[PDB]
């Protein structure tokens, strides 16, 4: 029986799974133009919310 | 690389001099001390003059001497 | 203490600081930019006009109009058409 | 072909002198001796920027200025070059500057 | 000290140039000639075109021409300057005063325009 | 009103009416710069005028720092003669003053807040970002950079008749916020 | 002459070597690389000093 | 879940690899979580009850923070490691 928990914990890794895809896009935009990034700025909260 | 932008720049001076107006051949040995040749090596020159300077359309020999021809372009 | 209020990010100012260190590209004579043109060619025979504008250190449209005068560009297989450093 | 700021100086006076008198010898061809300039211009650069490490502080007025191609050409007037363990007074001086 | 320097500076030269003078094919004697003689000789106007309305704006050019007084020969780090006043950062470089040769690694500067 | 603004800063561009090489220039002037990186012109500064001006290879100069129009023009003059001198063929063509600042105590302090209230149309209040007063004159097409302090700048003026009707017009508006 | 001519010939045997380095592996050529930096540094650093005459 | 599954994902979610020259390394190291909590159009933030929650239409959501190392490798032979505690 999945229950709230495994449930939860299976959407939880898939939103995370996508948050550190963005975080990876946005920081590669900013190393590949050759300025540091804001680790703050490379994080949407909206994704997991 | 080596002893191909040396001819290129030969090549530049020529249209140099036809900016100038001196329709009168020169020497190629006299245009590489204008242009800073004398480092290269001679063997280099020597197949530039045997090929390259006769395969280039703009480059005319007069007299064992070589330069533009003047007829080519539009006068 | 997320998203502290600030006058500049910090990478904003670093990278700022570097371009005004480095400042702009300059135009320089026409006979220089040619020779050095000409060395770069003899290094490789084909070059994208992205990197010889690094290798010049000169104004793309400057670069672009001395390359126009004797270089050409050659549509090609490669990847895409480019120019070819070779005046014929 | 490098930096060339030393040769208008003391130093590279007399070198330039020297290299003049063997030229005039027939010792040493004029390649040789712009090889000599370079190499030692190479030098005097690396043993400034090492061997030196004392600091020195100057004051005064600016009578003129002139940049160009990286390369400043200020001209002080009545200028007092002050360090900690001498004071040194010049009624004028010119400072040529490079990077 | 400062000729102390200059004699490792000497030595710099030397060892510097042994090995053009090998790529060259010379002689080794050519160093040691030239060491001894370097150390020998070291020790209403409506129609405005013209301009002649004007005359003495300048000052004598020949202070650039003569260059005797003394000289100084650096480089710069940073240069600023505020509406009066040019700062200085110059780095390690040699001056030339009253003959007298000296060596300095950081030099601060202000002056008035 | 009793009280004229006195100007601190003018801007005047002038052709020379000839191809310049800045290279050349930097090279024989006496305090001029040239930094093709930094920026495209030659800086010169004049001490007796006190003013710096920017030469362009198209001919074109700006002088500025002029306190007055004589000034100015002296100045552009001075600065094409030494052109000039160094050879070129400079000539004074098209002077003309693009802009003029000056500056003014009104001698009490303002309340800004009911300023930008009353005249929110032309006014521009943010201590964020300035923390002077800016008020878009429309019938002079001038910008004053009004202070709590009192102080009031007047910019984008053409001629000195503008600096003094602007004034003139904003005085009675600052003296109905007289704090 | 003799003695100058068996000196040079010395260097051929070296460039012999030189070659078995690029089997090893070239030295010659990347000889020439470091030749071909130089000049644009020779050409900027040249500039300074015909400017710098004039100015002094 | 809370305590266990959000934690442990965090943790086995690989680590950020960038590079295009310097490196950086992006690290998930500890989760926290506040109590529930809404933000007034102020900015305010105040705790939410569940009975506010259901009146106001707001969802009974709980702040998540997680602890981020980030590693830059500049390959001078110096890496800076600078830590971001609850982002």
């Given at each position: ?22 975080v ?13 990034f ?12 | ?50 090929e ?16 533009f ?7 | ?88 | ?6 040769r ?92 | ?27 080794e ?85 | 009103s ?8 003018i ?10 090489d ?7 002037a ?29 001919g ?10 004589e000034?100015?023009?002296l ?12 050879g ?92 | ?49 015909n400017?710098?005459?004039?100015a002094? | ?30 989760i ?37 190392t ?18």
């Open positions: 029986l999945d229950l709230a928990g495994p449930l939860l914990a299976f959407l939880f890794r898939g939103m995370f799974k996508n948050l550190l895809k963005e990876r896009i946005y920081a590669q935009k900013f190393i590949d133009r050759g300025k540091d804001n680790l703050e700025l490379a994080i949407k909260t909206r994704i997991i919310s | 690389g080596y002893k191909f932008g040396v001819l290129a720049k030969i090549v530049n001076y020529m249209k140099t001099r036809h900016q100038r107006g001196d329709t009168h051949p020169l020497t190629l040995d006299e245009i590489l001390d204008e242009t800073q040749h004398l480092d290269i090596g001679l063997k280099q020159k020597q197949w530039l003059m045997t390259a300077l006769v395969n280039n359309p703009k480059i005319e020999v007069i007299d064992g001497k070589y330069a021809k003047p007829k080519y372009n539009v006068r | 203490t997320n998203y502290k209020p600030v006058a500049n990010h910090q990478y904003n100012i670093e990278y700022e600081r570097k371009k005004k260190e480095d400042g702009k590209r300059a135009r320089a004579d026409k006979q220089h930019v040619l020779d050095m043109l000409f060395s770069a060619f003899e290094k490789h025979q084909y070059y994208n006009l992205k990197d010889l504008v690094d290798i010049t250190k000169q104004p793309v449209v400057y670069l672009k109009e001395i390359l126009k005068e004797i270089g050409v560009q050659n549509v090609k297989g490669i990847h895409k058409n480019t120019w070819e450093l070779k005046p014929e | 072909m490098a930096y060339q700021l030393y208008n100086t003391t130093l590279g006076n007399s070198l330039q002198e020297s290299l003049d008198e063997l030229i005039q010898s027939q010792q040493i061809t004029p390649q040789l001796a712009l090889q000599v300039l370079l190499q030692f211009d190479k030098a005097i650069n690396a043993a400034l920027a090492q061997r030196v490490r004392n600091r020195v502080n100057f004051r005064g007025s600016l009578n003129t200025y002139r940049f160009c191609d990286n390369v400043w050409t200020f001209v002080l007037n009545d200028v007092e070059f002050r360090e900690v363990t001498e004071l040194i007074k010049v009624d004028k001086v010119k400072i040529v500057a490079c990077d | 000290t400062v000729p102390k320097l200059y004699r490792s500076v000497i030595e710099d030269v030397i060892n510097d140039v042994r090995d053009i003078f090998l790529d060259d094919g010379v002689d004697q050519v160093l040691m000639e030239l060491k001894t003689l370097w150390e020998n000789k070291l020790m209403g106007q409506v129609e405005e075109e013209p301009l002649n309305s004007e005359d003495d704006v300048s000052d004598e050019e020949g202070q650039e021409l003569f260059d005797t007084e003394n000289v100084v020969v650096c480089q710069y780090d940073k240069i600023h300057r505020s509406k009066n006043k040019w700062k200085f950062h110059l780095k390690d470089g040699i001056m030339n005063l009253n003959g007298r040769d000296y060596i300095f690694s950081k030099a601060i500067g202000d002056a008035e325009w | 009793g009280i004229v603004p006195q100007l601190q800063n801007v005047s561009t002038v052709n020379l009416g000839c191809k310049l800045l290279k050349t220039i930097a090279l024989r006496r305090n001029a710069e040239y930094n093709p990186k930094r920026f495209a012109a030659v800086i010169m500064r004049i001490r007796e005028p006190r003013t710096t001006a920017l030469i362009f290879s198209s074109k100069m700006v002088c500025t720092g002029a306190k007055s129009e000034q100015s023009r100045a552009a003059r001075k600065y094409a003669r030494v052109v000039q001198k160094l070129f063929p400079a000539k004074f063509l098209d002077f003309k003053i693009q802009n003029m600042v000056g500056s003014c105590d009104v001698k009490f302090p303002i309340r800004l807040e009911g300023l930008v209230l009353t005249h929110q149309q032309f006014s521009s209040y943010e201590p964020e970002l300035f923390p002077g007063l800016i008020y878009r004159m429309i019938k002079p097409r001038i910008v004053l950079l009004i202070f709590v302090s009192g102080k009031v700048v007047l910019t984008g003026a053409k001629v000195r008749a503008e600096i003094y009707e602007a004034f003139e017009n904003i005085y009675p508006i600052l003296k109905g916020f007289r704090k | 002459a003799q003695l100058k001519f068996f000196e040079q010939l010395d260097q051929i045997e070296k460039q012999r070597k030189d070659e078995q380095e690029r089997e090893i592996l070239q030295l010659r050529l990347k000889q020439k690389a470091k030749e071909m930096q130089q000049q644009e540094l020779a050409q900027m650093r040249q500039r300074d000093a400017l710098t005459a004039l002094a | 879940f809370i305590q266990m599954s959000v934690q442990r994902i965090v943790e086995d979610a690989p680590p950020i690899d960038l590079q295009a020259p310097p490196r950086y390394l992006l690290k998930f190291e500890q926290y979580l506040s109590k529930p909590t809404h933000w007034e159009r102020d900015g305010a933030p105040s705790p939410m009850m569940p009975n506010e929650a259901r009146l106001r239409n707001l969802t009974y959501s709980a702040p998540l923070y997680v602890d981020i980030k590693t830059v490798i500049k390959e001078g032979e110096e890496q800076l490691q600078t830590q971001h505690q609850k982002t």
